[PDB]
């Protein structure tokens, strides 16, 4: 089925790879070459996750195997394997799922580019999705490579990856003092504030008080000038929201990338360059 206004946009072409071969929809989904390619990566990765849950860390007969949703964990190899492929039951399964995940993500983004070409719209969304992919690849590719072992990746488990985050963080004693981490968090918080402000404002002028007509661009600008003496503007709030969300992802990737590869001591002690300036 199609949205009642959709048929007049379902045009042939705009593919990057594949042309007419895969140029079709399946229900709502556009497929194309990267839909097929992404589907294979995705279905394989998910089924290898279920297979990893089925055999557990030490075989399906041990007390450690579990289908409990919180406890399932597929883990990377020991650091001793370095940049080599571990045996499937010793972290190699995690490594293959990682390659599947990256391919699924990147194929998803290129499918999005083909959709933009069909619709004649800007490429902001696949560009923005690339920042999330970049952060994932810093976590499983750039940072592990710089330290010399794929085993620095995080495990694929709903709660087990929180244990990874905790223990990597406290390797630096007090990870809160990571300067790129402070900046990234500031962007995450500011983004959430900005999103609630934006959502609120659009809903409050299109759903005004009873008896009122729909409000105007002049109301939107007046409302925040009245509260903070400034209005960024209806176009610019979307510029701002995109800037804050991408900055949050970017400084995230930076903050984990420097943790190990470019800094090994506690994070509070980094700030000693400031304390030690010959000014005070």
């Amino acid at each position: 089925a199609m949205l009642s206004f959709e048929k007049k946009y379902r045009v042939r072409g705009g593919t990057l790879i594949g042309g007419d071969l895969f140029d079709f929809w399946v229900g709502p989904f556009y497929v194309g070459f990267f839909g097929v390619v992404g589907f294979c990566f995705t279905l394989l990765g998910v089924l290898l996750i279920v297979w990893g849950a089925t055999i557990g860390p030490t075989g399906p007969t041990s007390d450690l195997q579990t289908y409990n949703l919180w406890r399932i964990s597929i883990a990377p190899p020991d650091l001793s394997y370095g940049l080599r492929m571990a045996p499937l039951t010793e972290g190699g399964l995690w490594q293959i799922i990682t390659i599947c995940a990256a391919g699924a993500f990147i194929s998803w983004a290129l499918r999005e580019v083909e959709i933009c070409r069909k619709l004649g719209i800007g490429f902001h969304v696949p560009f923005a999705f690339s920042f999330a992919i970049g952060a994932y690849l810093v976590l499983v590719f750039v940072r592990p490579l710089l330290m010399g072992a794929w085993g620095h990746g995080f495990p694929y488990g709903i709660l087990s990856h929180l244990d990874w985050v905790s223990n990597v963080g406290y390797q630096f004693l007090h990870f809160h003092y990571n300067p790129a981490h402070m900046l990234a968090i500031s962007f995450f918080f500011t983004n959430c504030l900005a999103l609630s402000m934006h959502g609120s404002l659009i809903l409050s002028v299109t759903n005004p008080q009873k008896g009122e007509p729909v409000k105007t661009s002049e109301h939107e600008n007046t409302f925040f000038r009245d509260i903070v003496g400034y209005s960024i503007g209806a176009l610019a709030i979307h510029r701002l929201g995109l800037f804050l969300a991408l900055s949050a992802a970017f400084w995230s990737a930076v903050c984990i990338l420097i943790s190990g590869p470019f800094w090994t001591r506690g994070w509070p002690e980094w700030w000693n360059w400031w304390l030690e300036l010959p000014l005070w």
């Binding site: 650091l79 995690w94 620095h152 495990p155 406290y170 390797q171 004693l173 800094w263 506690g266 002690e269």
Partner: protein, 311 residues
């Protein structure tokens, strides 16, 4: 800023994230800066005991005259090499105790013998010599006194925290955990043993004092928290490393050193050895470890000096 790649070590199970990272070039230079002085040649272990040859030997009674001389040579290089034998001895009278350095040194011998014989749960067979702390200086470089912190006006009580302090590795956590925990014996545990509320009165500020002590410990050993903990459950011994057990005994060892060996010497120590509160320079993890997981990278010096053990 540092450059990749770092040195790495896996501590816990794969994916749990218990890993250590270090700078390779700083490690190599630290190893050079933590060299142990080569042991003296073995001495003649025969003849009369020092207990029956000398006039006022109260601790090293059972050494032969040769081993006793060798011990005196060794402590001179370890403690007062620039000054020599008479840093601890009245000129022309070796038996005299009329110099404060000799009285202090006598108790220092008992400290080391107690550590090497009675505290192996901490120092194992590696043990300690005078060198471990003094490093060739009469005053150990990494002794400590109670820290008063920055000045406040008279109408505002100091908080003991919120200040950039090397002692807690530049966090704004309570910056003197040494006095309450490595001298006095305040409770370090705050984590509950039951899921539900009802039986744990420990406080968030106690958590911060404990966190401050743990920053100091980590910095003193040059390690991260996962050297001893799985940080998903800091309290859970079953998920901790064997280094945590060792560290537990080391805290009690340090308390014993400060309470029973350093503090009772306060009256004979000069005013130059005391902090603004009148307390003597004394011992923390840093004093021996000096930012290394084992003092001197674990060099076994004490085993070659029989006088550094009890009986």
């Amino acid at each position: 800023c540092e450059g990749p790649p770092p040195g790495t070590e896996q501590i816990g199970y794969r994916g749990v994230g218990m890993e250590n990272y270090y700078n390779k070039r700083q490690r190599a230079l630290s190893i050079q800066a933590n060299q142990p002085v080569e042991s003296l040649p073995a001495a003649d272990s025969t003849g009369p005991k020092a207990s029956e040859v000398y006039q006022n030997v109260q601790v090293l009674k059972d050494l032969s005259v040769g081993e006793f001389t060798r011990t005196m040579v060794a402590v001179t290089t370890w403690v007062s090499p620039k000054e020599g034998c008479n840093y601890c001895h009245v000129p022309g009278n070796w038996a005299s105790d009329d110099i404060y350095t000799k009285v202090v040194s006598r108790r220092m011998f008992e400290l080391v013998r107690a550590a090497n014989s009675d505290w192996k749960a901490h120092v194992a067979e590696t043990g300690v010599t005078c060198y471990t702390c003094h490093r060739g200086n009469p005053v150990p470089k990494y002794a400590w006194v109670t820290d008063p912190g920055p000045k406040y006006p008279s109408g505002l009580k100091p908080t003991g925290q919120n200040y950039g302090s090397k002692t807690v590795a530049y966090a704004s956590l309570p910056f003197d955990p040494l006095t309450p925990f490595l001298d006095q014996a305040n409770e370090i545990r705050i984590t509950g043993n039951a899921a539900l509320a009802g039986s744990n009165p420990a406080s968030l500020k106690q958590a911060e004092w404990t966190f401050g002590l743990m920053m100091n410990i980590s910095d003193s050993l040059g390690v991260g928290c996962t050297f001893c903990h799985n940080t998903r459950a800091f309290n859970d011994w079953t998920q901790s490393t064997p280094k945590r057990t060792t560290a537990w005994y080391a805290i009690r060892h340090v308390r014993d050193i400060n309470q029973n060996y350093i503090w009772p010497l306060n009256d004979v120590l000069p005013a130059s050895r005391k902090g603004p509160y009148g307390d003597p320079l004394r011992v923390s993890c840093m004093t021996c470890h000096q930012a290394v997981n084992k003092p001197l990278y674990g060099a076994q010096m004490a085993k070659d000096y029989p006088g550094l053990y009890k009986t």
